[PDB]
Amino acid sequence: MKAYMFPGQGSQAKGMGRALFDAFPALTARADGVLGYSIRALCQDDPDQRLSQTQFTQPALYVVNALSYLKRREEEAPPDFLAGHSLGEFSALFAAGVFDFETGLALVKKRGELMGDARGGGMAAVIGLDEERVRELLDQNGATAVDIANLNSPSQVVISGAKDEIARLQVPFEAAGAKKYTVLRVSAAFHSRFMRPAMVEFGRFLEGYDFAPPKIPVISNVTARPCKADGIRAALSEQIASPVRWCESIRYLMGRGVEEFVECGHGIVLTGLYAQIRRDA
Known part of the structure; x- marks a missing residue:
């Protein structure tokens, strides 16, 4: 059994995703439609170092993660489990079919705005x-x-x-x-109940969307357990005001019998974490 791990903020880099944008023009154009700028230019050219500004970082990583997943689905057997670190949860839920590509992107654009404004x-x-x-x-x-x-x-x-x-x-x-x-x-102290106001605002924003059940289980950062189909809004809104239980999420998967852990997205951040979690466990 295999799990895909989706990275979040801090893993971005100028030049990321180049070959993916080439390979997925329809999704690139649809991303541009949500964002109102060229997602390829953001990632390739990094104008005014906007890739380091969270309101842009989050959409960039969501898109590269999503396209990375779709490339893997064309080439490899489907994963048994999905998990994403913070922003990465949105790509995981996209992979699981909980929402379509554009919807997930709108959610992350909002998350970026809330976190940038915090x-x-x-x-x-x-x-x-x-x-x-x-x-x-x-x-x-x-x-x-x-x-x-x-x-x-x-x-x-x-x-x-x-x-x-x-x-x-x-x-x-x-x-x-x-x-x-x-x-x-x-911008702020994320992942404590200090961030409750933004959690509340994000929860309310998520009331306006309609979600589908996950086709592949997604391990929640909040609970370190599979997301409940009826619990998507709590999982995503509470995440920003709760500790990220990444180590426990990986250990849960190991305990379930997952032996193969693959990072899906740009970079090797989660691969490095996994090596350390594996060595200890």
């Missing part, structure tokens, strides 16, 4: 400490307005919360053995 707090990516140690450090350093935002691998955790606390934690984390502590280029 304010308050920040985030840091930590390499070299496990969840238990990170939680201990947050308590020891009195960072009561910081929480764990992503559990990405046994040694890769993202934290989120008050900007001053995120700044002040860097040296203590490094002194405890973090190999790297990197404050992220994000």
